[PDB]
């Protein structure tokens, strides 16, 4: 009574939990483990194991072996972790193709190990999240919302349908968002990100690396001296100086969010919403209807052409406007804002 965790024997066991949070370890042998209610951590260990999580958010920890396992997470948001396949010691399972693990949540299997002529699988059902290994991997989602993490290596991630959250990690990764409203994080290394259809979101870290960004259909967002961004020329310089070796390739992105430092953002011919956040920012909208937000600090705004609406927020903001343009809106906010008609 009043015991939450259990570790099994080296033989065949049948382990059942309760409505509380349990950590259930089966060790050697063929074990059937049920987590029941709550959030549970299930580790079958070596042997052919059948694992259930029932309701709640469960976690399955897999080991370095070729023996297949059956996993059914039931209701709730569930994840499976494959980090223990590659370890500093000696690895028993073969990876002769050099692909770590391969996951297809649409076809409900995980290729946990692979020799040249033999392929070892796991049967996975009702699991929405996957965590990869230190080597390169292939991660594929399904029609639901998935969280996919690649960890180290040169991984490839496909989210499938729905609103996903894809992580690349260290190394040079390939991330595909597919249909839905996705969120893409690249991490360290030189990556390329494309979200496809739907409204996507990209997050960058202002490091010394080169990334390729592709925003397909829909309105898409990128978030970060500060940066020098020119969507018209399709180039963003991360450290604020043009022509640097730390730059990004940008295509099909309409909205930009700046850094807390001093940034320079210029918009293309489409409709753009540009946000500068903290610091002294210089913002130009180009042509078409645009929305500009300078945030804190003293900012300078252009709104070159079209029916634009400009907000200055807190600070000593400066405005440039053409006297022959029509359909514009200005709002200096708090401070001694100045308007210039000499442009």
């Amino acid at each position, epitope marked *: 009574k009043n015991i939450e965790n259990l570790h099994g024997s080296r033989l065949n066991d049948r382990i059942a939990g309760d409505d509380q949070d349990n950590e259930l370890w089966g060790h050697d042998g063929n074990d059937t483990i049920r987590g029941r209610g709550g959030d549970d951590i299930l580790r079958g260990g070596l042997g052919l194991d059948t694992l259930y999580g029932e309701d709640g958010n469960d976690i399955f920890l897999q080991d370095d072996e070729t023996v297949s396992d059956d996993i059914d997470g039931g209701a709730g948001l569930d994840t499976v972790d494959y980090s223990a396949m590659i370890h500093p010691g000696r690895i028993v399972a073969p990876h002769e193709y050099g692909f770590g693990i391969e996951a297809d949540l649409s076809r409900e299997w995980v290729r946990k190990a692979s020799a040249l002529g033999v392929d070892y699988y796991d049967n996975v059902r009702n699991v929405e999240n996957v965590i990869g290994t230190s080597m390169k991997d292939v991660l594929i989602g399904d029609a639901q919302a998935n969280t996919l993490m690649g960890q180290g290596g040169d991984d490839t991630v496909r989210g499938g349908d729905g609103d996903d959250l894809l992580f690349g990690g260290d190394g040079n990764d390939m991330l595909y968002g597919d249909a839905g409203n996705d969120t893409l994080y690249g991490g360290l290394g030189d990556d390329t990100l494309e979200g496809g259809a739907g409204n996507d979101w990209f997050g960058q870290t202002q490091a010394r690396e080169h990334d390729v960004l592709r925003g397909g259909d829909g309105v898409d967002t990128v978030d970060y001296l500060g940066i020098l961004a020119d969507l018209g020329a399709g180039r963003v310089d991360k450290l604020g100086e*043009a022509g640097s070796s730390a730059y990004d390739t940008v295509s099909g992105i309409e909205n930009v969010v700046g850094t807390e430092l001093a940034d320079r953002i210029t918009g293309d011919a489409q409709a753009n919403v540009l946000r500068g956040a903290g610091g002294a920012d210089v913002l130009a909208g180009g042509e078409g209807d645009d929305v500009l937000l300078g945030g804190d600090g003293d900012d300078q705004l*252009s709104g070159d052409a079209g029916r634009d609406r400009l907000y200055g927020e807190a600070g000593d903001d400066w405005f440039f406007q053409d006297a022959a343009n029509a359909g514009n809106l200005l709002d200096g906010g708090d401070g001694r804002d100045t308007v210039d008609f000499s*442009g």
Partner: antibody
Amino acid sequence: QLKQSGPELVKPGASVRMSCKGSGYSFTFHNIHWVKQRPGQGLEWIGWIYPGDGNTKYNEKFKGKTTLTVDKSSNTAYMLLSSLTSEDSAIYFCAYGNYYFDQWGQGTTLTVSS
Amino acid sequence: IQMMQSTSSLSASLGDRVTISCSASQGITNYLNWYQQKPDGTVKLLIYYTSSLHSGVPSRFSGSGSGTDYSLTISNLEPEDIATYYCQQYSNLPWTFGGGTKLEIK
């Protein structure tokens, strides 16, 4: 629109400073680049200066003989040429833009002879 | 990046279609510009990307290409299209221009 200085006549070995004047919008939103054009030749890029902070980037083969300066107050850009030689006679253009040069000047002629 | 414009001279009659091609030593990932220099000496920007048209230019001009080969095309020539055209890149420092192609009416 950018306004440049008139034609200049100089003796070899001397130094000449050239001017390029614009407006607040151009110097606030854009970098300023300098381009030369030798007679019977094409166009060569020298470098740019950022008027807001004065930071500079130079072409490697023009590093020694070129110094870029900017006067943010009066919106004037200056290029200083040193050790003028017979290969330095050309027409010098100033243009503003970040990755593409949007507006060009009318040009300034430099004559190196005696 | 050394940038090549093999066709130094071109000729066409009013209403013809003209193609000017420029090539690069390596990949430029669509980071190329086209400029016009009239006989009077003025220099103007025509397209500020591989295909993006500038504000003040007519719809006659158009550009395309990808990788190491790019081209500027005149759909229907006009008596104001006599000038020299250059190709410039911003993919790697220093930024380099092309040799130039001159257009003279037949």
